Amino acid sequence: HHHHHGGAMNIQALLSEKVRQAMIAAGAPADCEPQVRQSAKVQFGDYQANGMMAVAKKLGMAPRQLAEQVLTHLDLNGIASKVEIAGPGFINIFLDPAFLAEHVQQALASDRLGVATPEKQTIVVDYSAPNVAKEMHVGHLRSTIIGDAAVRTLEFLGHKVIRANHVGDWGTQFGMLIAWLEKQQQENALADLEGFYRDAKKHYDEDEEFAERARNYVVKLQSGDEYFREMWRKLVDITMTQNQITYDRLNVTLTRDDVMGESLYNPMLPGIVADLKAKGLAVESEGATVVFLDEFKNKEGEPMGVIIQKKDGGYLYTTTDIACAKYRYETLHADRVLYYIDSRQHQHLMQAWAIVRKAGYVPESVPLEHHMFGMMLGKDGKPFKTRAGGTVKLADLLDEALERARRLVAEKNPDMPADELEKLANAVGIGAVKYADLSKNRTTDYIFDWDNMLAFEGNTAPYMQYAYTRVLSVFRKAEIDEEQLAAAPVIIREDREAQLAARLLQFEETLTVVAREGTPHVMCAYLYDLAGLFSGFYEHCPILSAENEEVRNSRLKLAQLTAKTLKLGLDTLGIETVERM
Numbered sequence: 001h002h003h004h005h006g007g008a009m010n011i012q013a014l015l016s017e018k019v020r021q022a023m024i025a026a027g028a029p030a031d032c033e034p035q036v037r038q039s040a041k042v043q044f045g046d047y048q049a050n051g052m053m054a055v056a057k058k059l060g061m062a063p064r065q066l067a068e069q070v071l072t073h074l075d076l077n078g079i080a081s082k083v084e085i086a087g088p089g090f091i092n093i094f095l096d097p098a099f100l101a102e103h104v105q106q107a108l109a110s111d112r113l114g115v116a117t118p119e120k121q122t123i124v125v126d127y128s129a130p131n132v133a134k135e136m137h138v139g140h141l142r143s144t145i146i147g148d149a150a151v152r153t154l155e156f157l158g159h160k161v162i163r164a165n166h167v168g169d170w171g172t173q174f175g176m177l178i179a180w181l182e183k184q185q186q187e188n189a190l191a192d193l194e195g196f197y198r199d200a201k202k203h204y205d206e207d208e209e210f211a212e213r214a215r216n217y218v219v220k221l222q223s224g225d226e227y228f229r230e231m232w233r234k235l236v237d238i239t240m241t242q243n244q245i246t247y248d249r250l251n252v253t254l255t256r257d258d259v260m261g262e263s264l265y266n267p268m269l270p271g272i273v274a275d276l277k278a279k280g281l282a283v284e285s286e287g288a289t290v291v292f293l294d295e296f297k298n299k300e301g302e303p304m305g306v307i308i309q310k311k312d313g314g315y316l317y318t319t320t321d322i323a324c325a326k327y328r329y330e331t332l333h334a335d336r337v338l339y340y341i342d343s344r345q346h347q348h349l350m351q352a353w354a355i356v357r358k359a360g361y362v363p364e365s366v367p368l369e370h371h372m373f374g375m376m377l378g379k380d381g382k383p384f385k386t387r388a389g390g391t392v393k394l395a396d397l398l399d400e401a402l403e404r405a406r407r408l409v410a411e412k413n414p415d416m417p418a419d420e421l422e423k424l425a426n427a428v429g430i431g432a433v434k435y436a437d438l439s440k441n442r443t444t445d446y447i448f449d450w451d452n453m454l455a456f457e458g459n460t461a462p463y464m465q466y467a468y469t470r471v472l473s474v475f476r477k478a479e480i481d482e483e484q485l486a487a488a489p490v491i492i493r494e495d496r497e498a499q500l501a502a503r504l505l506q507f508e509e510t511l512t513v514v515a516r517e518g519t520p521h522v523m524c525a526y527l528y529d530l531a532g533l534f535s536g537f538y539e540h541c542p543i544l545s546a547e548n549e550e551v552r553n554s555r556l557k558l559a560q561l562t563a564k565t566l567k568l569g570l571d572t573l574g575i576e577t578v579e580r581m
């Protein structure tokens with residue numbers, strides 16, 4: 001009859017192939033969508049094919065009587081134990097315990113838990129992007145964390161991921177900095193960096209000559225004089241040096257050679273504007289050079305002339321945005337570019353990208369995705385600041401996270417050696433910072449809350465990290481013949497075992513969603529449901545105290561895969577785990 005095509009597929013994908021073939025065999029067109037999704041309730045099975053009503057409508061027939069025809073052609077032997085029609089023509093699919101058992105075994109044998117590798121793409125990820133004329137702060141936090149989760153996920157799926165740290169390394173803010181560095185290091189001659197920034201502004205307002213000199217040092221830097229360009233590289237180098245040790249504390253995969261600031265695109269800008277003119281897209285308007293876009297309206301209600309070069313001849317964010325996308329396709333050969341940027345930048349991005357398309361700088365087959373996010377708020381519902389109202393240093397936020405975590409872990413003692421107790425607070429504190437962000441739909445405005453993010457109740461990092469330790473504590477090496485276990489089979493007999501196994505095998509399709517939508521909160525929700533299913537499994541099914549050796553070994557393997565899945569999943573979020581707590 002009908003056969004499988006290609007290689008290894010996850011359960012949802014395999015079922016889709018099978019249901020599609022049955023639909024086609026029943027008369028459905030070759031572009032039919034079975035819409036197989038995980039069931040909401042377990043009386044409805046593990047999966048449901050929901051695409052029947054839409055298919056029946058198109059062929060112009062009753063879904064209830066079409067579903068019975070599709071059932072006739074549907075072959076889930078060795079995959080589904082039971083398949084029945086429900087309601088208006090739903091297809092409830094109950095997974096075969098033998099099918100699940102073999103895939104649990106195959107997952108355990110694999111270092112990546114049997115997660116298939118998708119067709120490899122080159123993916124650029126734009127995130128973090130701190131202003132390097134000052135110490136990194138909370139305003140750059142969400143982008144750094146969410147973007148790095150996307151990076152980790154795409155890398156684990158075997159993609160070529162290019163981290164692009166679009167740092168703000170070319171503002172007027174440097175004129176003051178360069179002036180101060182000269183007034184010291186030169187004419188006068190990492191711990192001074194914090195004294196540096198403040199002492200720079202300390203003369204910005206108390207010396208007319210200095211603050212005038214600072215404004216024209218911007219010109220000299222923009223002129224291309226190698227003297228000021230070298231002093232500029234130096235203070236960027238030392239700032240990124242301070243930023244690296246903060247990234248490290250954050251457990252973020254960003255390094256020095258991921259830095260691609262807007263200064264990198266500067267020598268490209270005149271070429272872009274000149275080329276956009278040559279294409280007849282850019283024309284003069286009120287002294288400025290604009291591109292007219294039909295998709296946008298100005299304040300006058302007229303078609304918007306997007307400025308790519310202004311009257312004084314200077315460029316702006318749009319021009320860099322254009323050059324940036326072009327560069328990422330032409331030089332980096334991106335198949336896909338992801339921008340983790342605050343949602344208020346949407347229109348700016350859409351404008352610049354609309355020009356990118358018109359010029360044909362980036363083919364339409366290469367998506368430019370704005371993975372936008374809400375802003376960090378306080379309890380007041382207003383932008384995030386301290387007790388008074390100054391911008392929050394990331395280095396300070398991390399400091400308090402560790403200090404609060406040391407106390408929170410000292411609450412339940414739990415008494416352990418000194419070094420291990422340090423690693424424990426670090427995992428909990430920083431884990432909480434990152435997880436509290438990641439566990440929420442990025443698009444939503446995020447309200448920072450110390451009490452909730454560090455609680456052992458609900459979907460938080462400390463809960464996840466604790467649940468992981470309880471999973472480990474049942475797998476006691478000293479009481480397990482590991483060679484006998486590794487050779488032992490998985491035998492799924494109870495509904496809770498089958499539920500856990502099936503959920504464990506949905507690790508791949510969770511990753512598939514995260515990679516596609518750029519939404520790590522789907523991963524957070526999965527792990528939490530997984531931890532919950534294990535608990536129900538733990539409290540209802542004797543593991544170490546199982547009645548016989550076959551069940552003991554089988555349930556230990558389920559526990560083993562649960563541990564591996566929780567640790568790998570948390571790793572894709574960039575969350576550290578500990579052995580015990």
Ligand SMILES: NC(=[NH2+])NCCC[C@H](N)C(=O)O
Nearest residue numbers: 128129140143166340341342
């Ligand atoms: N392509 C860019 N302009 N990237 C910089 C965006 C800034 C950063 N992603 C943020 O919103 O926190």
